[PDB]
Write a protein that holds these residues in place. Structure first.
Motif, short mmCIF file in Angstrom:
data_model
loop_
_atom_site.label_atom_id
_atom_site.label_comp_id
_atom_site.label_asym_id
_atom_site.label_seq_id
_atom_site.Cartn_x
_atom_site.Cartn_y
_atom_site.Cartn_z
N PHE A 14 0.86 -1.19 0.00
CA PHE A 14 0.00 0.00 0.00
C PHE A 14 0.89 1.23 0.00
N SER A 15 1.14 1.66 -1.23
CA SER A 15 2.28 2.48 -1.63
C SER A 15 1.94 2.99 -3.00
CB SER A 15 3.54 1.62 -1.74
OG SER A 15 4.66 2.38 -1.40
N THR A 16 2.39 4.20 -3.29
CA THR A 16 2.17 4.80 -4.58
C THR A 16 3.19 5.91 -4.76
OG1 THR A 16 -0.21 4.52 -4.05
CG2 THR A 16 0.32 5.62 -6.11
N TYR B 246 7.15 17.11 -8.95
CA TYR B 246 7.82 16.17 -8.08
C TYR B 246 7.18 14.82 -8.25
CZ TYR B 246 9.86 20.22 -5.71
OH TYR B 246 10.56 21.36 -5.40
N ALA B 247 7.96 13.77 -8.02
CA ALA B 247 7.45 12.45 -7.94
C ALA B 247 7.30 12.24 -6.44
CB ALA B 247 8.43 11.40 -8.57
N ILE B 248 6.05 12.09 -5.97
CA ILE B 248 5.80 11.99 -4.54
C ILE B 248 5.50 10.55 -4.15
CG2 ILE B 248 4.55 12.83 -2.51
CD1 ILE B 248 4.20 15.47 -3.76
N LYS B 249 6.37 9.97 -3.31
CA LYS B 249 6.14 8.65 -2.80
C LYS B 249 5.26 8.72 -1.56
CE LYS B 249 9.33 5.30 -2.78
NZ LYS B 249 10.26 4.17 -2.39
N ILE B 250 4.19 7.93 -1.59
CA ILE B 250 3.18 7.96 -0.52
C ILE B 250 3.08 6.58 0.12
CG2 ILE B 250 0.78 8.63 0.14
CD1 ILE B 250 0.70 10.31 -2.41
N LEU C 249 10.32 13.68 -4.28
CA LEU C 249 11.51 13.16 -4.93
C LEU C 249 11.63 13.84 -6.28
CD1 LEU C 249 11.05 9.30 -4.13
CD2 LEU C 249 12.36 11.00 -2.85
N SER C 250 12.85 13.92 -6.84
CA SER C 250 13.01 14.41 -8.20
C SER C 250 12.19 13.54 -9.09
CB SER C 250 14.46 14.39 -8.67
OG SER C 250 15.16 13.40 -7.99
N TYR C 251 11.70 14.12 -10.17
CA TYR C 251 10.93 13.40 -11.13
C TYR C 251 11.79 13.04 -12.38
CZ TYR C 251 7.45 12.79 -14.88
OH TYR C 251 6.74 12.29 -15.95
N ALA C 252 11.95 11.75 -12.66
CA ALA C 252 12.68 11.32 -13.84
C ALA C 252 11.69 11.09 -14.96
CB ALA C 252 13.53 10.04 -13.58
N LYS C 253 11.62 12.08 -15.84
CA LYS C 253 10.60 12.14 -16.89
C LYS C 253 10.59 10.92 -17.78
CE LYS C 253 10.68 16.79 -16.10
NZ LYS C 253 12.08 17.17 -15.77
N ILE D 240 16.96 2.15 -12.20
CA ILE D 240 17.85 3.13 -12.80
C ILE D 240 16.98 3.95 -13.74
CG2 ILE D 240 19.94 3.52 -14.28
CD1 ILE D 240 20.90 0.68 -13.22
N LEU D 241 16.58 5.12 -13.27
CA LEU D 241 15.63 5.94 -14.00
C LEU D 241 16.38 6.87 -14.93
CD1 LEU D 241 13.07 6.74 -11.31
CD2 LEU D 241 13.25 4.70 -12.70
N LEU D 242 15.67 7.44 -15.91
CA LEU D 242 16.29 8.41 -16.85
C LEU D 242 15.65 9.79 -16.78
CD1 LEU D 242 16.76 5.58 -19.15
CD2 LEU D 242 18.63 7.12 -18.88
N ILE E 209 19.36 6.99 -10.09
CA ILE E 209 19.14 5.75 -9.39
C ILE E 209 18.20 5.98 -8.20
CG2 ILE E 209 20.16 3.96 -7.92
CD1 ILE E 209 22.78 4.18 -9.71
N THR E 210 17.32 5.00 -7.97
CA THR E 210 16.33 5.09 -6.92
C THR E 210 16.17 3.79 -6.17
OG1 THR E 210 13.97 5.23 -6.52
CG2 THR E 210 14.66 4.76 -8.85
N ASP E 211 15.20 3.78 -5.26
CA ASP E 211 14.78 2.61 -4.43
C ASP E 211 15.80 2.23 -3.38
OD1 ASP E 211 13.53 0.29 -3.35
OD2 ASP E 211 13.47 -0.82 -5.21
C1 LIG Z 1 5.62 2.54 -4.91
C2 LIG Z 1 6.87 1.94 -4.31
C3 LIG Z 1 8.10 2.06 -4.94
C4 LIG Z 1 9.27 1.50 -4.36
C5 LIG Z 1 10.60 1.62 -5.07
N1 LIG Z 1 10.38 2.67 -6.06
C6 LIG Z 1 10.47 4.02 -5.96
O1 LIG Z 1 10.87 4.59 -4.94
C7 LIG Z 1 10.08 4.75 -7.21
N2 LIG Z 1 9.25 4.23 -8.13
N3 LIG Z 1 9.11 5.14 -9.16
C8 LIG Z 1 8.19 4.71 -10.24
C9 LIG Z 1 9.81 6.23 -8.87
C10 LIG Z 1 10.47 6.00 -7.66
C11 LIG Z 1 11.41 7.07 -7.08
C12 LIG Z 1 10.95 8.46 -7.52
C13 LIG Z 1 10.65 8.48 -8.99
C14 LIG Z 1 10.93 9.58 -9.77
N4 LIG Z 1 10.64 9.56 -11.07
C15 LIG Z 1 10.07 8.50 -11.68
N5 LIG Z 1 9.83 8.53 -13.02
C16 LIG Z 1 9.14 7.63 -13.76
C17 LIG Z 1 8.39 8.08 -14.86
C18 LIG Z 1 7.65 7.16 -15.63
C19 LIG Z 1 7.68 5.79 -15.29
N6 LIG Z 1 6.99 4.81 -16.06
C20 LIG Z 1 6.11 5.23 -17.16
C21 LIG Z 1 4.81 4.48 -16.92
N7 LIG Z 1 5.23 3.09 -17.21
C22 LIG Z 1 4.14 2.20 -17.73
C23 LIG Z 1 5.92 2.58 -16.00
C24 LIG Z 1 7.21 3.38 -15.76
C25 LIG Z 1 8.47 5.37 -14.20
C26 LIG Z 1 9.18 6.28 -13.45
N8 LIG Z 1 9.79 7.42 -10.93
C27 LIG Z 1 10.04 7.39 -9.61
C28 LIG Z 1 9.16 0.84 -3.14
C29 LIG Z 1 7.91 0.76 -2.52
N9 LIG Z 1 6.81 1.31 -3.11
#
Ligand SMILES: Cc1cc(CNC(=O)c2nn(C)c3c2CCc2cnc(Nc4ccc(N5CCN(C)CC5)cc4)nc2-3)ccn1
Ligand SMILES: Cc1cc(CNC(=O)c2nn(C)c3c2CCc2cnc(Nc4ccc(N5CCN(C)CC5)cc4)nc2-3)ccn1
Lengths: 276, 276
Positions: free
Chosen positions: A18-20, A33-37, A84-88, A136-138, A146-148
């Motif tokens: 239960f995470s988004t 921002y990419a907001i982790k909830i 968090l920074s947003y990786a477009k 490894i995001l772009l 890099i994330t997670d």
């Molecule tokens: C929900 C969750 C995640 C995690 C590990 N992931 C992240 O922290 C994380 N996950 N994402 C998807 C991100 C992050 C860091 C913060 C973050 C910043 N920018 C992006 N950018 C991004 C943009 C598009 C996608 N797509 C396009 C839609 N596609 C079908 C899937 C990937 C994925 C990432 N993504 C993230 C652990 C527990 N719960």
């Protein structure tokens, strides 16, 4: 101190437990921002407090262009929010599937970025433990982010990461170290050049079984210098992997012939090669 | 916690008192910062502790794309270091002199950015008190970055700023407020359209004397809607200036006909108009 009402939430970037992760735009600034909830209840029930706490703590210590940045945290009655920074451009994996496999110039550039991010992360005594192309995001500019860091370890057993990238010593000694990340690095390089990871099977047990036997091979046209580097990272004995402390760290790894033409000093200001 | 040795210092971006802004590159990241360096001795001798402390405190509360950001501070035996965003393109003043004066599209875009930054700054109860084109920097992308918060006031007399931009009430009542910045704003708009500030004379006394008499005029081809806006900002009574609290704030100022075509919500993501 920000609150949910400061943002217009948009599309979901990813979902866990239960995470988004939600793309949000801050009303005052128009910044994305990419907001982790994270739901506080589920964190508590699942005994994940040390992990969520570690995630926030590691990200706060990171200040490097090849890592996702934590700009802010807040919380309400139910939830924790991390800004968090947003990786477009999403996941490196997206690009591996899209173009099939990377040419030599692209493999070299993106490996160098990952090596360079690891050098920094390892220099702070932090090991990732779940490194993979999904993590490894772009960014907008096609540089890595890099994330997670939930499952990261701050060095003073327990967590095993994604099966295909698990190192033998994790399956055998329950031990994790900087060479665990260097193993994942060799699996990623192989994956960039080959289009797929090296240890593949019908299920985890069967993948683990190949890993500990070093049962993989190179496709015939695999870049010779990349194969040599991969063979020096995919080494069963974790103290003989190029990049590790017993082998004198990142200097020899960065001097590897595959990286001959790399300028290590300002990679994030170099224009990345077009993905095919 | 960073130190001088973490950076390769390069060229001087500006010099004050015993003060220097130096372009620096962080060795670990290759990131460029503009590092402000202040000699603790001279701060103490000149009784400038409240000012340096206020500068650090105001910049730390600012989180908006049209303001210079404070990323870090440190100090050694002699000096305080502030790590600030680096605005590659320098001073707005540079551009006013270079192209002579701005067309209508360019005046509108850059005024809107300044208005929008003021709205944010004023909403936090902070007044700048020395706003001028030298302090309005331009980033790599040609968006504004406002700086120089040493002399700012956090609202719960004393400092008068640069002569050409001083508001009448400062010369008469020793009082400063949000309308002091709105006055500087009218002087800046006039300066963008006309190429020079409105109150000009041989010395400060003579400039002050014109200011309190409202002794300036518009050149004949001055954009009619810009002139109307300037005439509503350059108002001797500080409670009748468009944008101030007595006039109901930024809403009416932003609704001014000069801004008809402006999308106020995401200015920093709009591509700026080419300077001529
Ligand atoms: C929900 C969750 C995640 C995690 C590990 N992931 C992240 O922290 C994380 N996950 N994402 C998807 C991100 C992050 C860091 C913060 C973050 C910043 N920018 C992006 N950018 C991004 C943009 C598009 C996608 N797509 C396009 C839609 N596609 C079908 C899937 C990937 C994925 C990432 N993504 C993230 C652990 C527990 N719960
Ligand atoms: C030294 C000093 C300054 C101040 C007020 N100024 C600054 O804080 C300040 N001054 N500058 C020059 C900066 C800042 C903020 C932090 C900051 C960030 N980026 C730039 N960029 C920049 C780039 C080039 C120039 N040039 C090009 C060289 N040219 C001949 C002069 C202007 C000016 C500014 N500049 C600055 C008060 C007391 N002592």
């Amino acid at each position: 101190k920000k609150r949910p009402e400061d943002f217009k939430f948009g599309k979901i970037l990813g979902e866990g437990s239960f995470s988004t992760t939600v793309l949000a735009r801050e009303l005052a600034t128009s910044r994305e921002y990419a907001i982790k909830i994270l739901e506080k209840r589920h964190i508590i029930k699942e005994n994940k407090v040390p992990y969520v706490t570690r995630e926030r703590d590691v990200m706060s210590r990171l200040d490097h262009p090849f890592f996702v940045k934590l700009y802010f945290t807040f919380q309400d009655d139910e939830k924790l929010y991390f800004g968090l920074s947003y990786a477009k451009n999403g996941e490196l994996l997206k690009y591996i599937r899209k173009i099939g496999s990377f040419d030599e110039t692209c493999t070299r550039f993106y490996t160098a970025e990952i090596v360079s991010a690891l050098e920094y992360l390892h220099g702070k005594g932090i090991i990732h433990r779940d490194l993979k192309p999904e993590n490894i995001l772009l960014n907008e500019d096609m540089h890595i982010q890099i994330t997670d860091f939930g499952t990261a370890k701050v060095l003073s057993n327990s967590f095993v990461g994604t099966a295909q990238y698990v190192s033998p010593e994790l399956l055998t000694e329950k031990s994790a170290c900087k060479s665990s990340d260097l193993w994942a690095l060799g699996c990623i390089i192989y994956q960039l050049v080959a289009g797929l990871p090296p240890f593949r099977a019908g299920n985890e047990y069967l993948i683990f079984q190949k890993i500990i036997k070093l049962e993989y091979d190179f496709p015939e046209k695999f870049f010779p210098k990349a194969r040599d580097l991969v063979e020096k990272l995919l080494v069963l004995d974790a103290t003989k992997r190029l990049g590790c402390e017993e082998m004198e760290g990142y200097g020899p790894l960065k001097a590897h012939p595959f990286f001959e033409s790399v300028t290590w000093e300002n990679l994030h200001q170099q224009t990345p090669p077009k993905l095919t």
